[PDB]
Design a protein around this ligand. Structure first.
Ligand SMILES: *[B]([O])([O])[C]([C][C]([C])[C])[N]C(=O)[C]([C]C1=[C][C]=[C][C]=[C]1)[N]C(=O)C1=[C]N=[C][C]=N1
Ligand SMILES: *[B]([O])([O])[C]([C][C]([C])[C])[N]C(=O)[C]([C]C1=[C][C]=[C][C]=[C]1)[N]C(=O)C1=[C]N=[C][C]=N1
Ligand SMILES: *[B]([O])([O])[C]([C][C]([C])[C])[N]C(=O)[C]([C]C1=[C][C]=[C][C]=[C]1)[N]C(=O)C1=[C]N=[C][C]=N1
Ligand SMILES: *[B]([O])([O])[C]([C][C]([C])[C])[N]C(=O)[C]([C]C1=[C][C]=[C][C]=[C]1)[N]C(=O)C1=[C]N=[C][C]=N1
Ligand SMILES: [Cl-]
Ligand SMILES: [Cl-]
Ligand SMILES: [Mg+2]
Ligand SMILES: [Mg+2]
Ligand SMILES: [Mg+2]
Ligand SMILES: [Mg+2]
Lengths: 196, 222, 226, 204, 195, 212, 233, 195, 196
């Protein structure tokens, strides 16, 4: 799995590959790893498909119940709910989740939650087996306050390399853009991103 | 896998006199080949003219002492400020230790004080609560170095009277507090030389009818 | 064990503590860990004591025969090469961790050797259980262009750090100085900061204290004449 | 299972003024079972004395081996082997079995016949030499022996005083070990006389 | 196999050895003689792993018989025991060691003395007034410690041996089917046919 | 540990050694392996020191409660069964105990029960328990009779422990003797093996193997 | 029972005449991967205490939340919360020590090593250690992980015993701490150049220094080192 | 414990059980009765792990005695055997199962027939003319297969039982110190004091 | 360990960090992993220090003996000798070696020999624990026929990132330039490459 979330001037963009593997067999080549826990709070999932689905479903329930009582939750709040589940059940879970969301007050925010259940607020985050191969590239090429088009290119190029080198990553590159304007889904096919 | 036990080293020594008792222990605290502290007190005044030390895994040692000190406090509350005798303290400690029979306090416990006739008393425990009153006992890392020396120089074992050749034993004459402190100091000096976990400092607590007194002596720091 | 090696202006110095241990017991309080490979090539050893001794004697013996064969004074690189190839062959099972130093016609040299056969070059080195305490001192006080007096001071201070802070090290500091164009000076017990204090009591027994069953003269002499 | 503590036993050596002493217990057992109370662990080749603790078959084997080697030495050299030289021979012989060692704890004691200097030495099972000025200890109660020697010992003891010190060191150490005891022997060694004394001790 | 005992008295050595042979579930034989005559005045009893015991005993027997023919002379019990010990001390560091424990009872015709040697599979030799291998000694040494003398007769030695066997038959779980007893003295080796 | 107990004409003899070990290290030579449950009941201790001490002093509390509630001395059968039922609850948990419960009541006479941490409870005339039990059995079985005098029975028990103290490495120190009669138990002293061995050897003519 | 995932390395500290100093680097490692470069591992509690934590970062964040909650709870129904009944270093430590030993006793430890540095009400210096096993000890110098092996030897040359504390100034003490941090950067493979340092003085209070860097490093001698023995070029 | 045998003849059931109790190294007792009377015409012998055997037997005994008092009636052997089987079948899936094998010999007073039931620790019940637990059956079933009849007398049953015990004493490695024999018939339960 | 070799217009350049570790302890911070098996045939070493030293010493011996008989060996020949040792002793060795050399006929050549003992001729190669973090960066930034200054910058930037992310890599960046002009050693200190 190759997943990442990147804050930029107008908000935040989530990115992910579409490969699910059972050993070396690709059980699903068109997987959607960008999942919605609230209108403008999404997450990227890596690790166990069952665990991360179960967690995301529980979080979506918690935030739906939060909204009914206290109004729209912050991205920090959503990250905290993910953390609570990942930390307290660390012995039984294999889940690496990146939480990304857009407020109007706080704008674009990214929180990464690795295996232990710790929380880290960052300008951008990378995760999954394929992320190892792009630490160098992403550190050198990331800038703060990029444009939408620049951020899409940054994610497209980054995940392209992660896919190229990681066998557990592949298929299409899915992206989700989170801004004041709304929620936009993007997709990029092999013929496009392989020639980069 | 998680290992809930550790070894903090150290060594302790209790000697019962005719109208006094001493409980000594080195002040070094260690893990593996590192020194944590050169002065970490290990022998404690627990009230009612009783001194205690629980040597081995320090976390369990501190827990036990803390719980016994607590037991002394509640013994006063529940029984009209009655003085907890050394024999009663010993039995109470057995139940504290055996209560965790299937997940033991990993310590060698020794207490010292005076019995109800005013004579010197030392009691010794294993980790799971078995106990016994003794005239002499070393505990901890260098216990195997010290005990034989105390069999010889306190109980005059294998010693006989000149001229008789093995027929008449050396008589078991009583030892003064000054004489006992000499033997304690030599025991720890010798233990420090040949045991890597022993050193830094020696702290002795002396118990008499007048109360609890303390003496400190430097030990080699290598 | 704490062993160190320090390069200086016109040569190299090595040092070592004098404690040997079987588990938590001290076997020897004044152990000699500085070994002579040749007159002006010395090495300090950590790890398995029999191994450091044996591997030093073997290579030292072959170095002597080599020196006689070639009519040349032995070189440190030769001792290094012979030690590493021997240790590599035995795949780490010969537990010898060595700091090899010396002066020869090429100049002054300082190397380390590990049990699996890997070698390293440096101006300052440390090995053994107290190497971290020693390396802390070396990393704090080492500089380029040290004098002889400064290097001895630095080396012994690094051993002291091991003596005091590492339980695997103790007792005394041994030093060996190897300067270019001079005889190597072996300073046995250079420092003695761990003398035992006087005991409180004398434990000399009265004669006849031990019970005896039988006495007899033992014949140590050979078969006699007449 | 552990070869060095199947049979049990101990050896201790000490230096004095113009003399040395070496002593051992007499027990041989099969773990808990006591088998023999006459198993001496000190041997001598000329004026050089060797004590050996550990696995009993190897104790016997090594004695026979060093008798073999010291006898050939004497025939070729035309003189008795000295303690310093014998020490090196023990070390060489043990290290040749580096990866299949004899499970023993040897102890050498003697006086150099030319210089008159007292000499003691100890070894691990594979050859490392511990050449102490004061004392050497070995066996299943070595921890106990270290404690006794380190407190009781003082330098420059006269032969008859040294006897008392080493005897009390052995006896009280053995009594704190299950696999040692069942009798004891003490050798007092001077430049040209050697006295052997069997000690009375508890038989449990 | 199981129980082998030995006792040295004034003028002889007496060896007692069990008769049972057990293949796991069943007792295949109840009359097995666990001994070999090495020389006219030297007898060796044995116990250990199946096959190894007999193979070792017969190998030692062959070697001593070879020595006897070559030199036209009988080796002393001490000499035979040393030879046996060395073979076992050699064996313990072999690819597959002999798993055999032995007692050697002999009468030295030179010194006019009986001699009993106990040797285990490691090559551990001891000369004793009385000895045993396996769990036998755990029961029998206390009795022998109490009753034994160096000046006992052969008949007194057999009575003290009966007391040992009775204790074993009372307290040991395994039925060892009694013992074959053999005496070694100045006149050679003979078997006590009623015990 | 070597502990024994046997029934005879003059009641019961109980004899125990005094040694405690941790591996090869001799931890104590002065251990009290006999427990005075009441003036009529004794318990022996073998195996784990703590397990035995704790649960046998606990047994004495249960026996005291019985005779407070029933106004009558507890039977040896009932006392032994309280202990065996207790350790059976803990079966598998790793308790380590080998004990004889010894006493004398009117209805039973002199009685001995072997109680075990595996749950075994056996009534019998003779028992030896511990690492040196086999050594003690040898002396007992060859010298035991019903018609022994209190003096001769006491010596046989003392001698049987000595036999085991000598041979068994994990037994020794000293011998504690008790004699249990119709009117209660009676202590018969601590006997150091270091003095008892040489005394018995000289007087009895035994241990000719050892030199003295 | 678990295994630590995201981890923090050494925490080092020492006493001086008027107070205590404590320091720790800003790295969060993921095995051999130096994953997170902006992690604060010194957490102040009030104006008189700093808790330094090493080991598992998820457990560190949990402990951070416990301390935050402790301050909140102490203020409840407490008019002297900012005066006589404020949280002391000794109170904060004993609480943590209790939790650590309880968690190890349930076979579910907080996988950390902790040093509580601070100054008491009466001006006395407080410095004590606790870890995942519930083991505790005090010393003029204290350090965790690699610090124990490399920092302590250096810091003990300044303050070797109790009597050396009044003779040690804040300038000398800070100098020793900063040097120790450099040595750890040379030699610890799981350390970073960036670190935080905290001073708690009885006169000048709590001084918290962020974004410090290891400087004055010696590397020039590397150019002369060639090969592993015989190589000359 | 070790050997327990059972045989059902014309008018009675005969149970034979070994007397030995062995704590590893030593035989602690040679007169142990490995049986409990459940009711006047029902006897249960038992063998398995130490402690569990007696604890289980006495527990069953107490339950049947309770039933007898409550109803003033003796349960049939078939009914008792079914109760016992259920307890063991319950036990095998417990935290710590009873490690006990039993034989139940009873005389049904209603049908005027002897009945022998063999039940193992799993709760495996079978009614048999003759039965055994452990390694006993390996030696004894061949003899019983040859000599047994349904119309044998009690005396003939005891003779056939002696032939079984003799075979066991010949071929089994363990000394089980003989057997205690008990007969169950219309008149109740009695012990054969000489066997 | 972070090591790489890169061919360029005038020849080839080898690059390496200087860190040797025993677990987390840095046993040597100034190690030289660029080793000479012939005048203009060098190698980069990763894996066991003992194994790779022993191998390199044997190869230097073989090529010294080759030279005495048949004249200067090719880089391909040197790689083959490394391969033979690494392949035939694969069970007992842990060695990842990059062989780089300059001929006048063949110019700059790079051969990589991973754990198995296989040989791969490449325009450039990366290896060691730290190489994982720069696959993305190196693939995106490598060009054929670069200049000396460009290649030095490419290696400096690449190893800088590898050092930044890999705990097993660190210290100074050593480099060795192989051209017709000769053999040049370069060194770059932390203060220089960390600010890149
Ligand atoms: B990704 O590779 O980490 C991916 C993300 C997942 C949320 C779609 N995970 C998987 O494909 C996992 C295996 C795995 C691979 C690499 C790292 C960690 C885990 N697969 C599954 O969970 C899986 C596979 N087949 C069926 C169901 N689930
Ligand atoms: B040092 O701490 O490395 C030291 C140096 C030695 C060369 C003199 N080593 C030892 O003391 C070793 C420790 C060790 C113990 C066990 C296995 C391997 C290493 N000790 C000995 O070699 C030793 C132990 N007992 C007797 C003799 N030698
Ligand atoms: B005895 O050997 O069983 C003896 C009696 C015990 C009740 C004091 N036991 C022990 O000495 C045991 C060890 C042991 C030896 C042999 C067999 C079984 C057990 N020792 C201890 O339990 C013990 C307790 N505390 C400290 C040291 N040893
Ligand atoms: B590098 O990390 O691969 C490095 C290269 C080596 C040639 C100097 N190796 C090491 O540092 C190895 C350990 C290692 C770490 C990571 C991956 C593979 C191997 N170290 C040693 O071989 C070593 C350590 N201490 C002493 C001697 N050798
Ligand atoms: Cl999914
Ligand atoms: Cl290298
Ligand atoms: Mg010390
Ligand atoms: Mg033997
Ligand atoms: Mg004994
Ligand atoms: Mg790095």
């Amino acid at each position: 799995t190759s997943i990442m979330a990147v804050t930029f001037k107008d908000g935040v963009i989530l990115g992910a590959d579409s490969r699910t593997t059972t050993g070396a067999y690709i059980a699903n080549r068109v997987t959607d790893k960008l999942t919605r826990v609230h209108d403008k709070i999404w997450c990227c999932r890596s690790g166990s498909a069952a665990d991360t689905q179960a967690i995301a479903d529980i979080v979506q329930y918690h935030l739906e119940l939060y909204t009914s009582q206290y109004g729209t939750p912050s991205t920090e709040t959503a990250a905290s709910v993910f953390k609570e589940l990942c930390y307290e059940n660390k012995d039984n879970l294999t889940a690496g989740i990146i939480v990304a969301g857009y407020d109007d007050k706080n704008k674009g925010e990214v929180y990464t939650i690795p295996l232990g259940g710790s929380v880290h607020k960052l300008p951008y985050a990378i995760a999954g087996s394929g992320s190892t191969f792009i630490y160098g590239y992403c550190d050198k090429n990331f800038r703060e306050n990029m444009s939408k088009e620049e951020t899409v290119d940054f994610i497209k190029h980054s995940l392209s390399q992660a896919i190229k080198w990681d066998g557990s990553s592949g298929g299409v590159i899915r992206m989700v853009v989170l801004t004041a304007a709304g929620v936009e889904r993007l997709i990029f096919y092999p013929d496009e991103y392989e020639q980069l | 896998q998680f290992n809930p036990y550790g070894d903090n080293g150290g060594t302790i020594l209790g000697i019962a006199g005719e109208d006094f008792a001493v409980l000594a222990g080195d002040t070094r605290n260690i893990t593996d080949y590192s020194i944590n502290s050169r002065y970490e007190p290990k022998v404690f005044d627990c009230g009612d003219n009783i001194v205690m030390s629980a040597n081995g895994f320090a976390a369990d040692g501190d827990a036990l002492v803390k719980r016994f000190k607590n037991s002394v406090k509640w013994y006063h509350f529940d029984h009209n400020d009655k003085k907890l005798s050394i024999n009663s303290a010993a039995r109470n400690i057995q139940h504290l230790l055996y209560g965790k029979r299937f997940f033991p306090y990993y310590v060698h416990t020794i207490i010292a004080g005076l019995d109800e006739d005013g004579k010197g008393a030392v009691y010794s425990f294993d980790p799971v609560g078995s106990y016994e009153r003794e005239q002499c006992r070393a505990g901890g890392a260098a216990a195997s170095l010290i005990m034989p020396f105390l069999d010889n120089q306190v109980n005059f074992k294998n010693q006989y009277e000149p001229g008789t050749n093995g027929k008449v034993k050396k008589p078991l004459k009583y030892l003064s507090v000054e004489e006992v402190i000499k033997l304690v100091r030599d025991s720890f000096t010798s233990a420090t030389e040949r045991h890597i976990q022993v050193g830094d400092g020696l702290e002795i607590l002396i118990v008499t009818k007048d109360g609890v007194r303390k003496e400190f002596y430097e030990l080699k720091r290598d | 064990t704490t062993i160190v090696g320090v390069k200086f202006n016109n040569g190299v110095v090595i040092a070592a503590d004098t404690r040997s241990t079987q588990g938590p017991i001290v076997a020897d309080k004044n152990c000699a860990k500085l070994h002579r490979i040749s007159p002006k090539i010395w090495c300090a050893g950590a790890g398995t004591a029999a191994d450091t001794e044996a591997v030093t004697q073997l290579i030292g013996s072959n170095i002597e025969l080599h020196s006689l064969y070639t009519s040349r004074e032995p070189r440190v690189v030769s001792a290094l090469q012979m030690l590493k190839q021997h240790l590599f062959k035995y795949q780490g099972h010969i537990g010898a961790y060595l700091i090899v130093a010396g002066v020869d016609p090429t100049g002054s040299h300082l190397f380390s050797i590990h049990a699996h056969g890997s070698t390293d070059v440096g101006y300052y080195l440390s090995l053994g259980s107290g190497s971290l305490a020693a390396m802390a001192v070396l990393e704090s006080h080492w500089k380029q262009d040290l004098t002889k007096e400064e290097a001895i001071k630095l080396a012994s201070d690094a051993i002291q750090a091991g003596i005091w802070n590492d339980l695997g090290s103790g007792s005394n500091v041994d030093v060996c100085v190897m300067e270019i164009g001079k005889d190597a000076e072996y300073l046995r017990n250079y420092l003695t900061p761990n003398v035992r204090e006087e005991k409180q009591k004398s434990y000399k027994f009265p004669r006849g204290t031990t019970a005896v069953l039988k006495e007899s003269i033992v014949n140590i002499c050979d078969i006699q004449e007449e | 299972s552990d070869p060095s503590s199947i049979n049990g036993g101990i050896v201790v050596a000490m230096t004095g003024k113009d003399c040395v002493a070496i002593a051992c217990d007499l027990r041989l057992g099969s773990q808990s079972l006591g088998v023999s109370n006459k198993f001496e662990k000190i041997f001598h080749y000329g004026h050089v004395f060797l004590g050996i603790t550990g696995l009993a078959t190897d104790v016997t084997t090594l004695n026979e081996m060093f008798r073999y080697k010291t006898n050939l030495y004497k025939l070729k050299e035309e003189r008795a082997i000295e303690p310093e030289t014998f020490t090196q021979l023990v070390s060489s012989s043990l290290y040749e079995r580096r990866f299949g060692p004899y499970f023993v704890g040897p102890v050498v004691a003697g006086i150099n016949s030319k210089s008159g200097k007292p000499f003691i030495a100890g070894f691990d099972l594979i050859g490392c030499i511990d050449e102490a000025k004061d004392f050497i200890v070995s066996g299943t109660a070595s921890d106990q022996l270290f404690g006794m020697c380190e407190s009781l010992y003082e330098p420059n003891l006269e032969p008859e005083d040294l006897f008392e010190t080493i005897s009390q060191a052995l006896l009280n150490a053995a009594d704190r070990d299950a696999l040692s005891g069942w009798g004891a022997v003490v050798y007092i060694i001077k430049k040209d006389e050697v006295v052997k004394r069997y000690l009375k001790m508890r038989q449990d | 196999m199981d129980i082998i005992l030995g006792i040295r008295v004034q003028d002889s050595v007496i060896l007692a050895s069990s008769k049972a042979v057990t293949r796991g579930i069943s007792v295949l034989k109840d009359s097995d003689d666990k001994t070999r005559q090495l020389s006219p005045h030297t007898l060796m009893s044995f116990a250990g792993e199946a096959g190894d015991t007999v193979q070792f005993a017969e190998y030692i027997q062959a070697n001593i018989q070879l020595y006897s023919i070559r030199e036209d002379y009988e080796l002393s019990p001490q000499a035979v025991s040393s030879f046996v010990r060395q073979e076992l001390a050699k064996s313990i560091r072999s690819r597959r060691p002999y798993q055999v424990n032995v007692l050697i009872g002999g009468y030295d015709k030179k010194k006019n003395k009986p001699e009993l040697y106990q040797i285990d599979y490691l090559g551990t030799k001891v000369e004793l007034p009385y000895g045993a291998h396996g769990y036998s000694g755990f029961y029998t040494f206390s009795l022998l410690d109490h009753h034994y003398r160096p000046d006992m007769t052969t008949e007194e030695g057999l009575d003290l041996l009966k007391l040992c066997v009775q204790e074993l038959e009372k307290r040991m779980p395994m039925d060892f089917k009694g013992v074959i007893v053999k005496i070694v003295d100045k006149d050679g080796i003979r078997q006590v046919d009623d015990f | 540990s070597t502990t024994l107990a046997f029934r005879f004409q003059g009641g019961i003899i109980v004899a125990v050694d005094s040694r405690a070990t941790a591996g090869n290290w001799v931890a104590s030579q002065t251990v009290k392996k006999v427990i005075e449950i009441n003036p009529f009941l004794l318990g022996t201790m073998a195996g784990g020191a703590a397990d035995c001490q704790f649960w046998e002093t606990w047994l004495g509390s249960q026996c005291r409660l019985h005779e407070l509630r029933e106004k009558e001395r507890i039977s040896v059968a009932a006392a032994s069964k309280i202990l065996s039922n207790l350790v059976y609850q803990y079966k598998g948990a790793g308790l380590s105990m080998g004990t004889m419960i010894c006493g004398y009541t009117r209805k039973e006479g002199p009685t001995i029960y072997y109680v075990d941490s595996d749950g075994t409870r056996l009534k019998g005339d003779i028992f030896c328990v511990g690492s040196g039990q086999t050594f003690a059995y040898g002396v007992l079985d060859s010298n035991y009779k019903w018609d022994l005098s209190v003096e001769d029975a006491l010596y046989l028990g003392k001698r049987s422990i000595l036999a085991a103290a000598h041979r068994d490495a994990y037994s020794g120190g000293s011998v504690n003797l008790y004699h249990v009669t119709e009117d209660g138990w009676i202590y018969h002293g601590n006997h150091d093996v270091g003095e008892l061995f040489w005394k018995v050897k000289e007087e009895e003519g035994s241990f000719n193997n050892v030199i003295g | 029972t678990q295994q630590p995932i995201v981890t923090g390395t050494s925490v080092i500290s020492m006493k001086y005449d008027n107070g205590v100093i404590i320091a720790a680097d800003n790295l969060g490692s993921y095995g051999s991967l130096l994953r997170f470069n902006g992690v604060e591992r010194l957490i102040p509690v009030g104006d008189n205490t700093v808790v330094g934590i090493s080991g598992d970062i998820s457990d560190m964040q949990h402990i951070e939340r416990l301390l935050k909650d402790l301050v909140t709870e102490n203020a409840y129904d407490n008019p002297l919360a900012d005066a006589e009944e404020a949280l002391e270093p000794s109170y904060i430590f004993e609480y943590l020590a209790t939790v650590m030993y309880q968690r190890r006793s349930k076979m579910n430890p907080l996988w950390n090593a902790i040093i509580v540095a601070g100054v008491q009400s009466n001006g006395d210096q407080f410095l004590r250690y606790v870890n995942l096993l519930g083991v505790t000890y005090s010393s003029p110098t204290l350090a965790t992980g690699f610090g124990a092996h490399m920092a302590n030897p250096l810091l003990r040359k300044v303050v070797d015993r109790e009597s050396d504390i009044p003779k040690t100034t804040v300038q000398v003490a800070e100098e020793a701490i900063v040097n120790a941090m450099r040595v750890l950067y040379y030699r610890d493979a799981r350390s970073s150049r960036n670190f935080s340092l905290a001073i708690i003085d009885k006169n000048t209070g709590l001084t918290f220094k962020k974004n410090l860097q290891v400087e004055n490093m010696k590397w020039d001698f590397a150019k002369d080192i060639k090969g592993y023995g015989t190589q000359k070029i």
